[model samples]
Target: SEVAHRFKDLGEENFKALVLIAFAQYLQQCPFEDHVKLVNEVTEFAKTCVADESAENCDKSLHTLFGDKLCTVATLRETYGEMADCCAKQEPERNECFLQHKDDNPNLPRLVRPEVDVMCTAFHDNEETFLKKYLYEIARRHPYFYAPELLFFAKRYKAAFTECCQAADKAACLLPKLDELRDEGKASSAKQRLKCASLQKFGERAFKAWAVARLSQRFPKAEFAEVSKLVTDLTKVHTECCHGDLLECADDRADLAKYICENQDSISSKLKECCEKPLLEKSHCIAEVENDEMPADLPSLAADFVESKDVCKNYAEAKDVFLGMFLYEYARRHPDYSVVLLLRLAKTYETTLEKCCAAADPHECYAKVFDEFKPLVEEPQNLIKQNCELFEQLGEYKFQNALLVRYTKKVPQVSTPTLVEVSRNLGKVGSKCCKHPEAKRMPCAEDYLSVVLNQLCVLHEKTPVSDRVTKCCTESLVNRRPCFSALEVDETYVPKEFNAETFTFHADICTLSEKERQIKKQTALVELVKHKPKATKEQLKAVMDDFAAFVEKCCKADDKETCFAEEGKKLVAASQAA
Candidate 1:
């Protein structure tokens, strides 16, 4: 009815035809589930029309006008399947074909004047302003027209509009400002721009005027002046805070919101009232609410904290402030946490704390280690804090003695100070590798010390203890600093044990002490000489001399078995050739 009234100047016949075509389209577009219901309403309306006319010719006139296409199964199926197919089609292409394909039915447009005809006539009649206004309405009524679907309609509309505008001045029929409003809104933010395009029906002043009107309507009992002032205050704040670099503005707004919530009990009641405003006003109002109360609901604030914690959990790093602080606090409660979980935390914190605290100032730095891990001192039930110190001392003595007692089962004749130094070095390794949340939990504490001593004793056989320590400390810098520190400590200390497990060897060269290595080399030389019966004593002695040099070079190297086997084959060839 509103559309008919607005286009009443188009004449009664043309208007009726337009109504008939649009009414058919409206029904045709109805969802399949709604089809049967709309048909019933239509049949009832047709019956009423016949009764009101009081004429036998009523059905004939209506049939001629509307045709038998009304409720036929064919018509219903075609219409239903058409849109169902349309809905099933792919994206932008689906929307592109939708409006245009429907408009293609020749009878539909002939009955309801085509867009070109309607637009051309309105412009040709020097009704450019009205045409522009009508087109704006069309855009508003079918907001989807602003999307990719517009491209299909734009060509025809543009040509018709251009023709109409050229008849007078180009500007006459054109609404460039309206077009900008639609286009520019999309340009602002692709996602949010569609929102701007939708609001084009309200014209350029739409944003500000729309807000004011909405506010007034929302609070009808409130004075218009009060609502207007609220809008103005809200707009000003948005301009100042929100209309900036988005991420920066978000942080600023968050800070402002925090400040408001913190001091809401003291700010004016007027601002506080904003929280109870409509959603738009309420959001803005709460952002600036001032009262001796919370700006946001207390429960919501608590929920937000929980949400933030959960969200930040993935983003958190081992040394992240929140992570470190939370872990420290959680660890402080001890048995409240599972042993497995604490073990994981300790492993993570042990590594991360070292790196994070590596360059920090002394007091500040040590606190990260001592402060965060101090709660670990409470575990294992058997070890008091004093026992922790004693066990730590014992771990060091064992690690040092593991080497010294291996060869002779007696302390080396090193001075007491050197023994103290070696013990301290071993203590460093204990502090790093042997240490655990609870002494009882670390069943492998002594085992690890033995492994280190075994590994070190193996090294000492090939190199001096001082030189091995120098290399070992530098090699494992990433391990506990104390482990590396222990490696650097005992320069003069001698190892007593040669752990066969730690001695690396392959099958050919195999495991051998220094004396056994000499015997094997002698056996290999004598076997080569025996196989060379033609060789004189001088030749055999010279070959043996060369074989000694070869053993020192190849057999003593890493991959000793391969090196010795390869060189022995060469010596055997040399003896045979001689």
Candidate 2:
């Protein structure tokens, strides 16, 4: 098996490379479920070729087809000629010796995305040969995406050409399927990373249980028991893939596509289009598609929220399954809340569990977990809609300045610099995400807003200036921004005393550069805002106008002194009025 599998050279680097050529066809037909079956077959075929070692060949000449191609992998410039010595030996000893020249799966290049036109042209030239090169292309790109997973991606492209080649316009038909396969690979890669880490942490059984439970929720109208049975068959292929069984994983996933597609209607009609997809498309589409229908009655989850004496014992066995089900349960009941909110609820629950499970009287400690299970408050989805509409209408610069003004009035005791920082970051988020597809723009806005608000919280962590800031800062991040946004402006804030000694009107001050003059004037504005902390930007602007006009008169006279003492007195009094 190892010897035959190691023969990756497709273009007759030697006879061993010919082994890969045979399996390349087999990849489309069947990937061995019984590992020994394909190994026994390929090994026998390689030996028979040696038995027929003649200049001329059988059936259109293997040499003519396997001669050379555009790509081959040569690791560290060493030929595998020594490993070829095993090719003449018996099959059992052959693999034993092949392991000695062990080419551990080396880092290989990312497969360059193929041209749809180029692919269709070759696909027409010969279907079998085109797919062989396609599969070989994926194998050589090893380090970026490892086996079985990449194999799944390869099969997706293969099936894409297989189906679409029958169309009137082959390249046109193949385009979207190819693009979806590429995009699905990106999402699949991320989920696979997290999935494998989970398998390692949760082990196969518990992780399997968790995945089954999580997927079962997708078909809310179907029998949960029935859906679990079906999805387990699917997720099992994933579990094997994570453990590094390439051929079996590919085989099982391919088989499950049929099994799943045949029965997809029982669970949800929404999955029909996805299940009709080929190979990896069918697999990924089913996993990622949204749930079909929201049921009228939600589960009590009463059994899960138990008051047991050995609370930790149950948790140890269930591990993450507990959290996964809780998330799914709470999510379906309260479907409108964004994922960030749901994540906090899970985290908060875990914290409560950790403390209660550690307590001496755990039953008493755990009783309150259920009481806290009621939904957390969230702003209406309209909050996202209303703001994104405003963002589109106002544009980014106007939106940013608008936020700076609004937040400054709300938390006017905070420094102007910090408010400006928060506003600019929020505007960048708005500009980038405001155009997200209509369905997602709301959650996009809600999600990034938390990032800016969290930074604002950190800036004032030690020195929260008002009652609202102090109270809202300690709340969970999901709740904190909404809390701050909802709070009324505090009239009781006492700001830092303004320093009046720097105020001067002289001709030399007017000689400063534009930037330098702006800085000086901004500092004065900051001082006035500090003293009159309750004032709006309009009130502050009025003070700046009075002060600027009075300074123009004083500087024009080329003199220094009491213009501020006289005219600036009213400027000072005007700010305090608001």
Candidate 3:
């Protein structure tokens, strides 16, 4: 009624006829590929759903349709199972009904594969029909296997029978081949478990946006909405087909494949070769197509983090819709965030708006929400401050060692080797950063340190760590530093019992470079620190300097070892007083 004036030319009969045309076309395409009594029977009964729209007759007619002996029975039921739901609602409510249950498929049987013997016989009699049936059957048996992967299975089966059917012992040869295909299907099903979970959690819209954003990053020249439309339709290959209904899923993909094949004149010329590929390989080719280089001046922009003054008015009018829009925009803007962080940020935003928009000074309260990011802002700054101070005092080697000890205590889930590698990199970064001319080191430290943090993020994404590290690694580089900085130290992690004898330096150390002497002083300092674990860094630095002075004075003295051993006592004796 809101826009009834605009649709005056489009009447109810016109809408129904257009809708029937889709059904008619769907029927003409004929997805029943299995050549059997059940396939022919299914083709006839599929007509019953469109002709007879009674919910009980169709609904009751639906579940009573077939059993597991024939695979096409399951296909027929799901194909028209969708039709009946749409038919029951008609245009007035059909779109809402179809949209509603697309992902939330009812508990339908995901059966074992169609009989290998039946399929082999179909192959022997009519080869083309057998391949088509095999494609349809493989998808039904393992619905999560996509068209590209399914094409692999179908080809294997066709070639297997082509050779094996003429073998000395045809059935025996085919038996082993079928087993190979069976194992492949099993492997594919297990591989897709995570993909199915992703579709179930992210649902339809956000998942599409998220994936499209990732593709956008790869091919910056591509238009967002056009690529988005293609990928969105293809997601049904996951959302519906992955559930227990490849019957409708394959048909949906077929329609999508045809649409793209026919209408890809406007998409990327670079991406065109993929679409022009043979029907079976089209989507696969498109996915593996080389991305165009991003422009030098290209900007990474999304919706700004702000809201209108009328946010409260529309929010109350449609809270659910408003929250989802807010969540999508947030998710789209910061594509680096995982669903976990995106959901966490969205929930926090919801809680903020729960009171902020209703406060006496709404705009003031809204702007104050930006301060909620203060902890995220401060976490990295605090680390940079302490790291710089330590780097300045301890120099590179001790600085790296100290960081190693600190991180081992914090994130033990990271392998010591990788942690060692990262610590050394950060330590080198710190040394160069702090060694910069005055007034430049602060930003210098963050920028360089952020690069290492980004590399760590990438490493953790591939060679995943504990959930804490994994979650932090999902953030953008700017946010990643703080995220890693905020990680809680493992309470159970204890440093090894360090040997703290505070060794005496020999006359050979005096013959060495100043670097070697400073390192020896550092070792003694660490030993002193180890023994007096309760002392602060400044106190420890004082003890280190005292040892360095003793080294400097005594290296010129007759007795180096005694001065090294004896003067260290006074440093620790005074240090322990704390």
Candidate 4:
């Protein structure tokens, strides 16, 4: 009965943490060897549970290889130690103590602290005030960490299981084999039977510990709550579709993957609804949970409309002064429009104005095009204002999508929850906005507010833009919204011009102004003439003229500086040849 005794003595919190570690390894497709490591880790910790005097060793063993630091929670050992002493009295006391002291707990340095600080100053005080921001920020830092629900569930399960084992009679521990337990009346009716089965499945033998741990290895704690419930859900999954076929999990087949994708909405919503209840109530109400698929409700706006800030950054040519001024005015009027959207609209209008607005009657050209296209230009702005609530809701999801997309791809290091405060904040942000009549049509509004909303959200995610790129990009919220709107999507965005080593559509980080370009071009010609001092004035003039002509032909037509640089070198060679 040492195994049974160890299970009881292991204490709930430590056991649950161990379970989460094993479960994480399980869900991540960790190799069998990794499972063995976690299994051994949990078993060793179980050993410290045999006697009261070994509690210190139990605490020592709690600091497993992966447990020392979780995202910014590096001081977990001290924090937990303080928590134990402070919360030892009552459940209420423990909660109040932790809440009182969580702020005193130091955070591991955050990579996104500056951006987070700006978010705090603008919208939130901490994760408490804005749980989504905190979650997004932490997920950005540790993309591998389980979702918040999963993390909280594991901890909550540990607490509930500890109480169950202490309260239940081992002799009556949901007696008999698997099939009988499923059908047994007492076990069927009594909720605590699930915990009894979870323990008994481990058995009293030393080897049973490994078997019990292996169950988690195969299924993972994040996927299912209790072992008993996993059996029921797995069977339900099998009969529900796999239908007597030999698939261990839905993860095994392409058809299953597609099946999951098709039914992802139901799956996500079901799990969400299940966990929506009080934490302890849903502690072991098992259902399979996975975040492998993008959310079913993820708007097409997030998928289709990639924003760029390059519109203003690139087309503000001397010849396009009117176009630039027009854009500036347009942007000023629709302050909420992203730079990317404005750029797209500006370019279209720029082309029309250039063609129609002649020198003789530039005013006529402006009048004709504005008369023709005013509705089109104002369409997005009007749509956004009309569905301001929807646009704002769509904006939040877009922000989440950007954070998740970047974290999963770029892995930026950085770093929840009073429900009343969370609920209050959600209400403030328009709790029903997602389902609003106007919001429902947003996916099809790509020709209107879709692109602009996406750009706006992407810009917001990179707020308080890092100083390295901030100087060149402009920091005024109005200015930078468009500036970042011009940036490549997250992974390809280069914060600094010098660091921009690759190309993305509309992501030219180092475009020179007309004045800067002329100055640099003049300096280049000076150096070229100085180097070829043997050349006469006419020859020097020929070199400068040819270089100017080359720029007009090869660069200005396309507005590609890289192209100009390449062709301009030939002009230097031609000067030397002369």
Candidate 5:
């Protein structure tokens, strides 16, 4: 019935929002399996929400609580893409057709207008081109989103382009050869084979260059491992179909590839420095310096490494950088609770480098350290941006911990006290005890005073400076106006000793009719039981303790049982009336 009701509520935006809210609450309380079932039906019906045509709707449906809209869209696209790919065998190019359509459609915005402006300006005028190229950027902002299969998409594009160019060039280059071979007897000559190979090589080079350019534009900050992987694959393809040697011989192409290799090494070093060690040791060397004080030559390096600002080797480099960057960014936002995890990683990198490079290359360790701190220090404002939330969390944690430690103590040896009465009496009694001049002279008075005063200070200082306090403390009273001012102002100015009235007074809550006290206890317990029906057993026990403690305030602790039982009966009667 709930599932049917959920289906009926679908299609409306508010209903979807409501469902999402319920889903979030369910996830908070339920185990992981139940958590999945709670929202799986809604997740199924909302499938098409991420299509290019659905972009505007997705954008409108954006909520910070749900994170990135593009991620949601990308997820739907990926799911639909897989489905299309499975069925595309019959149509041959159906998958390709869908991909092109997906790219061509409008993209949803994952940020507010200001961030939208920043993202737009970040890409210059190539908004559409960049979005298609860096669709993984959308995934970067979502918790569960790993980057989409950008490398796969780019690989397919590269392959298709490679085939097209090779075929076209082969056909074009053959025509002139055929014409010349007809005039002479050169059809079976080695020259014909060489020319065909040259033409295919040209096609390969063209595809490789296209792939590299696409990757560069999309990820200008990717490291060499990523770049080289793409380049290596694309280059191997180019070598097969065309003349890779010709491109390498050219200064610029050769230099670019070399640069990519160097940059890839730099990034790999940083990634290793930032992350935990791999199963298999990489050949990367660290810089080390020997010290007599230390048993091993320790490298001084920071462990936190950010990604680079260089393009990877080629098109196939796409997905790795995207995935790594997303994971890194997420970790940066929500750092591991364990302190110095990254720092340990940095040390491990230095150790490995020292072991590999010997003590001679100490600069390597220094470079690794800087690489680790790069992310937090990437932009001019990065330090402040990184520290802001952390500082807030620190302040909140300290304040709450102070309150919890002072106000609440868990003791296993004793039965729970009348906590509320104990708390109230402790405050009042502590003030009197601390001010008692005789108590101040006791052996442990200083420690006792320190404890009570610190607790009182925290309770008062952390509380808002209440307007009620100011109102209650009138200006005249705060100014220490003499109580005898009306009678002896002249004498007060003279230095005559002043004697003030001495008096004593008392009022009795017990003097109220026995019926009145019953009504008070009954009313208080009635409200408590009503409001706290679902209260923990401990909490209910605390209420009973408070009732008994109140009786003990007048009678001795040993005599409180009868009064508490009588009060409980009256409390029950009041609850029945209500």
Candidate 6:
């Protein structure tokens, strides 16, 4: 078989062992950190199916070589769960993974595949009904002691609805109470309801109220951001399943990374690629990377917390909410940018502590609360701190490489350039150009690195450089290319309000293109041929052929639309001429 021929040298055992070894090594490295890149590598492997249609041989080869043995319950669950996660995330990796196996395990029931579009479309069509029944409707009927659950549902529902609204059409049905609750909460008398000023109650109430209001003001923006992300995720399922054109998407991403690595003065790329390409169009455009029309209430909330007379209680709640949303938003926008996610989450802990200090009645009055809350504060902060330290370590690796040139006399002399020194120098220059007085109106951090790199090139030019010296001589100083920015739209937002009036003209197959047209034509022809199986294959080909012939003659007469619009147009014209 092709499977045997492909790995003729490496027997089945060896092939399986080799693949498992690679995967083990891969897992030994960070999984979450290299998730997408790993997925990309796997997909590149899966693309081999394009040239080979011998599904059985192809899959046997994969099983023999890569060893994706789905024998254990854990492996089955993991494999299925990963596909589901990818489907949810709209990652193509899910489809690519399954497509590779489809040939071998012909009997394997696919939970979801890119070949199937019906489920996703159905989900989109019934989104409002699905969501209402899924959470809000259930929550609305359920009581307020489930207030936390209700809030959680509200957030989830809002996030989904927001995505759909941005991509296709606004889903008012899903978000009927959004504005009402948001505005009302801002002016909510939680203090009066709780009937306590015992510093704790007063502080939490104020904090919650302010945070909720601030969130409300940016409701549209938040909705827009979420909807866009949803679209990308949803389409990702289709893209992954289809497994056709990824080179287009990958090409864009590769270029942007390369542009940054070079430290160019200006981004010389498509207008859309340079500006709207990554930010406005994709999830990366959110406030964490660069704040877009932030809620006015945000600063108001921050103001109350920072400038309050009794800052602790007020600050904690508000800080927690703002930082939580900020971290969440950043994660949503820059799913790939782990650094921002770390920073934002860390700030959440810092702000939470500042706010909780209001009623720090360290006498064990709220021992239980501290027991729970302290861990929440600590865990995320520790995670962020660890990631930041790792990032710093990675940065140090690059700095050490740069110093290689200086030591070897291949570059200008800069004695003992430590990472701390490089970092300090970067900050000094950045502060002057950004956070300082004179350069107050300078470029922001998003574009700052590109600018700094350009200046460094200028500096290198001014000094005598050695041919042996490579600027930023790190092995990992990769000239990464710009990747295609994903812009997702929720299918629920599509205007599926089909009207019978346009059915005849709109449903016609003549309007569609190649593959889709071929599919539709095949569907009709298949139905005809099935009923009359004895008919010659040539007769089956006659179906679209007749339609094509009709189109050519009708178009030549210059009355294609009229042929359908006016049934008797031709007959009437002939009679009139007669």
- The most accurate candidate by lDDT is 2
In what order do the candidates fall by TM-score, top score first? 2, 3, 6, 4, 1, 5
Ten-residue stretch with the least lDDT total in model 3: 1-10
All candidates: CA RMSD (Å)? 32.2, 16.8, 19.6, 26.3, 31.0, 28.7
For each candidate in turn, the TM-score is 0.18, 0.44, 0.38, 0.22, 0.17, 0.22
Q: After superposition, how far is residue 180 of candidate 6 from its true place, in Å?
A: 53
Candidate 1 lDDT, 1-578, residue by residue in tens: 22222123333322232323233332334433333333344444444443454433343432222223232332444545554443444444443333323321112211123354455566567653433333333332332222212222333354546565556644445455335545433322222222232132223333334334333323333333444455454344333221111122222333444443344444334445654443323444563232122123213322322234342333245333344333333332333323323434445454643554445342344334434444543342332233356546545433333322221112233222233333433444445533456533333243233333323332232334344444443443222223432332232444332222222223444454554454344443323322333323445446656755765666557763776666656655564567
Instruction: Write one digit per residue (lDDT tens) for candidate 4, span 77-107.
Output: 4433443443244334432343233221123
Model 3: per-residue lDDT, tens digit, 126-146? 885556545544443433454
Return the lDDT, model 6, position 155.
Answer: 45
The model with the greatest TM-score is 2
Span of 10 residues, lowest total lDDT, candidate 5: 283-292
TM-score of candidate 3 versus the correct structure, residues matched by position: 0.38
| Candidate 1 global lDDT | 0.37
Q: Which residue runs of candidate 3 sit more than 4 Å off their true CA positions?
A: 1-37, 40-152, 156-239, 242-245, 260-270, 287-303, 307-355, 362-578
Q: What is the C-alpha lDDT profile of model 5 across 1-578, one tens digit per residue?
A: 22223223333332332333332221222222332343344445344443232432333322211222212322343333433332333222432232222211112353322333343343455533443333232222211111111222223333333343345454344344433422222111111222222234234433333334334322334443564466555455334212212111122222333443455443323333313322111111111111011113322212222222221222125634443333332222222111122222333433444453344544444355435545422321232233233334534322222222122221111111222222332223223333334312221222222223222222232232332222222222211111111111121111212112110001243455453343344333333433333332444434544543564353443443554455545544543343
Q: Which ten residues in a row have the lowest lDDT in candidate 1?
A: 103-112
Q: What is residue 181's positional error in candidate 6, in angstroms?
A: 51
Each candidate: what lDDT? 0.37, 0.54, 0.51, 0.33, 0.30, 0.32
